[PDB]
Curated annotation (Swiss-Prot), chain A:
GO terms for cellular component: cytoplasm; nucleus; protein-containing complex. InterPro entries: Psome_chaperone_3/4. Component of the 20S proteasome chaperone. Forms a heterodimer with IRC25 that binds to proteasome precursors. Interacts with POP2. Belongs to the PSMG4 family. Keywords: Chaperone, Cytoplasm. GO terms for biological process: chaperone-mediated protein complex assembly; proteasome assembly. Involved in 20S proteasome assembly, facilitating the alpha-ring formation. Involved in maintenance of telomere length. It comes from Saccharomyces cerevisiae (strain ATCC 204508 / S288c). This is Proteasome chaperone 4.
Curated annotation (Swiss-Prot), chain B:
Present with 1820 molecules/cell in log phase SD medium. Component of the 20S proteasome chaperone. Forms a heterodimer with POC4 that binds to proteasome precursors. Interacts with POP2. InterPro entries: Psm_Assembly_Chaperone, Psome_chaperone_3/4. It comes from the Eukaryota. Belongs to the PSMG3 family. One of its GO terms (biological process) is nuclear-transcribed mRNA catabolic process, non-stop decay. One of its GO terms (cellular component) is cytoplasm. It comes from Saccharomyces cerevisiae (strain ATCC 204508 / S288c) (Baker's yeast). This is Proteasome chaperone 3. The gene is IRC25.
Amino acid sequence: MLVKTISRTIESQPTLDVIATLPADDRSKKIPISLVVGFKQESSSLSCYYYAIPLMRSNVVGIPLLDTKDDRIRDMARHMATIISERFNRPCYVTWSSLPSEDPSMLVANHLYILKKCLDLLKTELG
Amino acid sequence: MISYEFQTHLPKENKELYVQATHFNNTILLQIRLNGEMDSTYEVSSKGLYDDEEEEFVRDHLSDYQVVTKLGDSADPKVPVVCVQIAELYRRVILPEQFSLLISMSSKIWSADDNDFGKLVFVLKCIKDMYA
């Protein structure tokens, strides 16, 4: 199977809930990463859907596929997709999933943490 | 939190077809990948809302959608057909076993046509077999 999806909670700052669709076999190529990421409780909204891809072959180009008016959400989805695409040299689709209870100021306060934890997870899961 | 998925091969060297869906309060996000590839995205949303009972049958079964191309070809005649059929499957069948659907898919699954009804029916079956 050339792709797989995994469900992960990232713990120990808000706990994050992740669904990631990933190439099963990986160097840097054609199969996109899709990431759904949000806070976890214990229904959610798809707040933003962002796409990025390396322009050449670093230049990665990106665009909102489903935009949000909230800069705090947009920033996160943009950074996530763009940094993932750069990091792994492949296209990336990112969804930011918002708990009914979400205060997006949490994304601002934990911005760098959220990005690095997702990169870390993806590193491991791509090996 | 809840992911749905289904992995098979296009009928009958068989290419891998992978479907996955995440459901949200506003939308469902559906992936349809061909050999892991995915290059287009579309937003499918519903257009608003003696004598005879047929005119209410007509209105109650008039199901039109707006298909917006977010990524990929915005002038493929086969896309709004596929998208509406997927949308209708979700509305009438899958939910249960408001309407917005975001579909990311490989354009390479689809008088230019190849074997389009059989291929459409198979993909619809895959989505249903997921429990979409």
